[PDB]
Amino acid sequence: AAPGSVVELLGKSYPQDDHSNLTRKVLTRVGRNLHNQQHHPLWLIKERVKEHFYKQYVGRFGTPLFSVYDNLSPVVTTWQNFDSLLIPADHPSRKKGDNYYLNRTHMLRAHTSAHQWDLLHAGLDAFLVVGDVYRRDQIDSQHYPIFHQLEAVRLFSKHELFAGIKDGESLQLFEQSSRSAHKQETHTMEAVKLVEFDLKQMLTRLMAHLFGDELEIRWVDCYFPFTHPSFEMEINFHGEWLEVLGCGVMEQQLVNSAGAQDRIGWAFGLGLERLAMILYDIPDIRLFWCEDERFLKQFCVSNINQKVKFQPLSKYPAVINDISFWLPSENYAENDFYDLVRTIGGDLVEKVDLIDKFVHPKTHKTSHCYRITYRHMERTLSQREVRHIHQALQEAAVQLLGVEGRF
Ligand SMILES: N[C@@H](Cc1ccccc1)C(=O)O
Numbered sequence: 229a230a231p232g233s234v235v236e237l238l239g240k241s242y243p244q245d246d247h248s249n250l251t252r253k254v255l256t257r258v259g260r261n262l263h264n265q266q267h268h269p270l271w272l273i274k275e276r277v278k279e280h281f282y283k284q285y286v287g288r289f290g291t292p293l294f295s296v297y298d299n300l301s302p303v304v305t306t307w308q309n310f311d312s313l314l315i316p317a318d319h320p321s322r323k324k325g326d327n328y329y330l331n332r333t334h335m336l337r338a339h340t341s342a343h344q345w346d347l348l349h350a351g352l353d354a355f356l357v358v359g360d361v362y363r364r365d366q367i368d369s370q371h372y373p374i375f376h377q378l379e380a381v382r383l384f385s386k387h388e389l390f391a392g393i394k395d396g397e398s399l400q401l402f403e404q405s406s407r408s409a410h411k412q413e414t415h416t417m418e419a420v421k422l423v424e425f426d427l428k429q430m431l432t433r434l435m436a437h438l439f440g441d442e443l444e445i446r447w448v449d450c451y452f453p454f455t456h457p458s459f460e461m462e463i464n465f466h467g468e469w470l471e472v473l474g475c476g477v478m479e480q481q482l483v484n485s486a487g488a489q490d491r492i493g494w495a496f497g498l499g500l501e502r503l504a505m506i507l508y509d510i511p512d513i514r515l516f517w518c519e520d521e522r523f524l525k526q527f528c529v530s531n532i533n534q535k536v537k538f539q540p541l542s543k544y545p546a547v548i549n550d551i552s553f554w555l556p557s558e559n560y561a562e563n564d565f566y567d568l569v570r571t572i573g574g575d576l577v578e579k580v581d582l583i584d585k586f587v588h589p590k591t592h593k594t595s596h597c598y599r600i601t602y603r604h605m606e607r608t609l610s611q612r613e614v615r616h617i618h619q620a621l622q623e624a625a626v627q628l629l630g631v632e633g634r635f
Pocket of ligand 1: 496
């Protein structure tokens, strides 16, 4: 089960090192490209978004052709994923505990924004990126190691932005003042208000297209290193406000660095599983990855506009088991255990909760106790088979994570 190094992926070879933390299970998902699978719910959202840009977005010059990139390799450099987007070298979004690193220099993209700089650099004014993205996180019905994002970028020239106004040729895109909560230092408020208006009006119309003139949305001010001002859009769903996308006015240093210093732009990044789970009332993110026809056939529509009225699957009983152990001497991350659960338990596991931790005074070691909910999306799980999965996770935690079984 070692080496250890190398890792081979899509023909290329990645020497392992101190950053390397890809699990075999996660790599078996690379290439699957659910966003490209005809009649998959993620493919369906992608197509409806594409049609909206092609038919229903208007510009004064008028409206850009959005070139669509849904087949980019997820293997990116840390420069693509982080530095091109002005993300600081000490930013927590870079933590080994949160990202799948092939090694020091390469990784599975954590967001589709990892392609913004390159596509700008190629001179494109308007583009969509659709792709599988990869993040190390907890286990519950809303988190999965792979999910899918749709990115959009839209640049404006000065005369395009101000095209509707009389003395517009004296209005400008850029100035030299201060950054506020409302604008970057090199942007005029004249420009920012028009870009922000275009961004939100375009997203509101896309949501009305996807959902119907019924839904309740709200804009929440937030922060990203690569846009300013920035927002999340939240949809109220089952009584709770849920974020589905981040967006904002692109940081001018990013746009200038790619070679488009005569442009101002907006960008957004939407979570396809998050929206699909809301649009269709899909209760667990693991359903996107199952091949059960009770789920999948419901999204075979005659055309991408035939409304699908998702009928929820039966829920099957769960088996609950706890697992406690002594942490190794200062070398452990919660997300390592979560990776190992994914590896051994796979899609049998509905969630894992760290329920207890304490330090033992005589020994100085830390104990963790995790509660593991076993529940299959397609069938009832036998006590017998869960017992065997659980015992294997216990032994595996001892061999690989260096834990000491406390149970
Ligand atoms: N990349 C961000 C979303 C985003 C895209 C573009 C602009 C602003 C925000 C994320 O994954 O959360």
